[PDB]
């Protein structure tokens, strides 16, 4: 945008880039459906990643638009807006006090890049649906973390398009390390890995060693990646912790995507997946259940790790939790 209105409104919104509760939907509209491109770019300047890793601006914008282009516009929930949100949320979690000066620039880059591509080329249906229809993607990945593996493959592969290699100036050592962290992070986003991820996180909280700086102590890759994996995982499962105004938009979108999968399964004569049958759904009830058995249990543990950094996030969560609970019909 130039010295006009359309710009001011966008730039004014990008001002909240470092705050939980960013009006990502507003930005999506204002940026002409380029929330991932503008939010990623802003965060990259904000963290001075272009300079640090010598990323030509044009290569970065080209890769970003390409990546965003590979998110499906026709998918209600798993699209570029969700990706921008997970990225922005991770960017905020990276700045939590308890993690001050803990992670390197490269590790920061990995968490942000991973967030950016963690759902690219999502068809809007689950792994199980792809497995049951014997999709080519499922045959390729042996029914294991099919989509997650695919998100990774596409994210890296897009680096190869014209003027898209944003890591062209990283040394071989940086590339090997970045790639491994990105893979470890994205694969951890598969919900089939939630429980174990949460378990290890709790075990870590029970070993919580703070440094002379009062900041978490991570002296090995295993601990370092585990925090990064859970961070991005919390960001991916953070809709319930956002201002009700946003949380509600996310809920309607996920439900629309689920119901759409349900209709496809109904068409094909397949068994309709949980929460995907629009004729017998409990949106309000499912949200409460989602928060009770997964979101709240996860964020609570995370709050313990960075205590008291995420205290406000939890309150918002428990609050939103009540809101939906009180909307449950009778």
């Amino acid at each position: 945008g130039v010295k006009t209105e359309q710009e001011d409104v966008l730039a004014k919104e990008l001002e909240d880039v470092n705050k939980w509760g960013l009006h990502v939907f507003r930005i999506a509209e204002l940026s002409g459906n380029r929330p991932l491109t503008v939010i990623m770019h802003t965060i990259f300047q904000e963290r001075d990643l272009l300079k640090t890793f010598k990323i030509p601006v044009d290569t970065l914008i080209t890769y970003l638009m390409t990546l965003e282009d590979h998110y499906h516009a026709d998918v209600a929930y798993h699209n570029n807006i969700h990706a921008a949100d997970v990225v922005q949320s991770t960017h905020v979690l990276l700045s939590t006090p308890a993690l001050e000066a803990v992670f390197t620039d490269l590790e920061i880059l990995a968490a942000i890049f991973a967030s950016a591509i963690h759902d690219v080329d999502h068809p809007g249906v689950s792994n199980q649906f792809l497995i049951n229809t014997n999709s080519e993607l499922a045959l390729m990945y042996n029914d294991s973390s099919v989509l997650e593996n695919h998100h990774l493959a596409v994210g890296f592969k897009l680096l190869q398009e014209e003027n898209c290699d944003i890591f062209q100036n990283l040394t071989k050592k940086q590339r090997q390390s970045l790639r491994k962290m990105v893979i470890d992070i994205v694969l951890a986003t598969d919900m089939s890995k939630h429980m174990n991820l949460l378990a290890d996180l709790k075990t870590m909280v029970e070993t919580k060693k703070v440094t002379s700086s009062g900041v978490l102590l991570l002296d090995n890759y295993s601990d370092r990646i585990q925090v990064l994996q859970n961070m991005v995982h919390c960001a991916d499962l953070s809709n319930p912790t956002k201002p009700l105004q946003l949380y509600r938009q996310w809920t309607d979108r996920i439900m629309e995507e689920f119901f759409r999968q349900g209709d496809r399964e109904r068409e094909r004569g397949m068994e309709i997946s949980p929460m995907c049958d629009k004729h017998n759904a409990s949106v309000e009830k499912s949200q409460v259940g989602f928060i009770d058995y997964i979101v709240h249990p996860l964020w609570e543990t995370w709050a313990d790790l960075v205590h008291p950094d995420a205290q406000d996030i939890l309150d918002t969560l428990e609050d939103n939790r009540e809101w939906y609970q009180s909307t449950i019909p009778q």
Copy 2:
């Protein structure tokens, strides 16, 4: 969706619309809305039944429906022109062209099957951007197909690959001979939809019109495979370029869609600092002029030659084309 084995009110209305399946000018857009965005599946199913293809090739009905929905699911809902509605249109248009009097009893069931299947998969998984855009961005699709008929090769590969999903092999009961023949014809047909082949296709079509030969029943005579497939390639190519030959109401809807798709590519090209492709600049475009040029240089030359081949069965179609051409002519702002 029905109630106690009876059609729903919507299914009934859908059925009444499908009554014009054998007519040029079907309200394909209404069919799309009434079918819940399943124009390709219903039109294909209607056509297979009408032509008794399920029995002839022993295609179980469940398998056909499953493959149809799967094929339709792979057309992009976010692509304004090259989507399932366009596929359904090319299918129904080819279906009407196959029934032309001049081609009565000319083709076998397998050739008919091939022309129809080819029409159904001809643009599957179209990304909404041209081959050149895929080539210039060094997409993996262009790498895989060596920048040659990139999209056309991809449509074919996807069309056939989907037969491998659960209960999707509609050709499971065909012998190897039928399958190799079917496959060869379908591949020959779809690759012929690449506009870069237009001129040579048209050159060949004319050659045939020059040496055209009618049989005992005033029907076209096509010996060798070269001439039979050539006619099928041109038939599906005509169908793919039939929007301007349709009643103005339908034609204008197609024009809005292709222009919307073109402008989106232009916008992406501009964002990327790439040269903007012809007719893709929403800031510097002449929709009317382009449609006039499109008809004069490509569509009319092709259809006039086809009208000649099946003379005089395509007379009305040609008259409608010329009328739409003049209409756009008088709209060009001066």
Copy 3:
């Protein structure tokens, strides 16, 4: 249609050898020669007939043979160890392990089919280099599989993909539930052959041995999918690492082959200026020492645990392993 699945005038001598298909120590190399380098095809064919799997799963014989030939053709003839002979060996070995008294009537026909098929495809299209080599060169394969169990994921993909070639779907008559169950078990088994999972597999095998339960019949009790697939994973893993437990004559040919393959990789890593992988440096090698070490830290701890699970069915296999270990120890140049 031939007797053993492949034409051969030495068929008589092939029959003599194949009579030992149920025996530990089959002359797989001799069978490879007599069958015309078709060890995997004839041995698999023989086992399927013997176990009556063609009848049970309604597998047409021509389809089974076509798939087997296709699968075998996809093992590299230029790879000294991870080839069709190793595949045939693992299959036959798994076949014997499945027949151990302690497991009589424990596994279903579907589970048996999974273990055998998994063994057959577990190394298909192996390039003769390790996962790290594929990862360090940024190969397309490692890119696709995100550096995780690259080869193993590939073996599975190819194994299932080949079912799509002409007349190769040996599972065409299985119900959808049988296919999904089979598919899941096969994947679970092949992914477990990744040596990076050896320790965790063994640790679990030991825990099972500690909590070992038997039925009224003196047969292993396996209550849940978890314990079932675990025994099958370790079973195939044992067969894959069974060379040191075979008659010295056979064991030595396997050692010569794996060493040749390792050195082959070492020369490639040397040319490329890469760090040479362990045991892959022909200039600094201790073949004998390495075998003894392999037995002491990997092979014996695994087989001792397996022997305890099916005690005393594998006592002779364990005794041979120890006889062979001593042999290599006595050949270490001092």
Copy 4:
């Protein structure tokens, strides 16, 4: 070093037609493709011209050579080395002095190097008949040729393998198109049209102020490069008899293996692939009479008289096989 001397000794003929490519294979430890490419790249100063780091070049050459099947009797790294070296000699022909740019030269050499990479040792039809994944991906059209290209370019993406990293975008785009055009033209299904176009060019042949071929447009320039590499690919019968017979034995061994596999599967056995009903000699004479001679004869015209000796050797070899045809 003892053999390093023999290698360098043999490599002195890299500019000569009839190089003992088989000996180079042995002396180099089966690295003919890599060594010959390296020599030619230095010989033509290509590393400097395009700023190709030596380490990157050799890594890619080894990687490309590794993707040639060592189990395949004919379409392997030895055949690729041979086609590259032959293309190298043809490019140096007097009638073409200073005609082609270093990018066009690079294109022809590169294309020759990758033109058969990852060849399975069976024909396109075999792949099509078995519904192989490759045929499904390429819609039964130039299946293998398309694949050779795809692999050739994909391998540039491996660790330190991008030999074109320092070419401008303009050069990369131009090179890619030329390489694709050249390799796709090695598909025998394109033979007749290529020849027809080469003959036409010979009819309307024009030369510059220096007497070298006058190639005015891309269409004409690429057509000459396509046919050059095509001639290099079909140059076995033009080499001295001793090498030629070694190649015939290799191709027949590959064909027979395919025939054995087709018979095992109950498939129709492809022409010349039935070891129980073969006519090696007859096939070579027919191959020369209907394809190799018509092609080389027209090329000889185009570069007259540069290829006279090559054509004479070809005709002699043909007479030789003729005399071995039974009955």
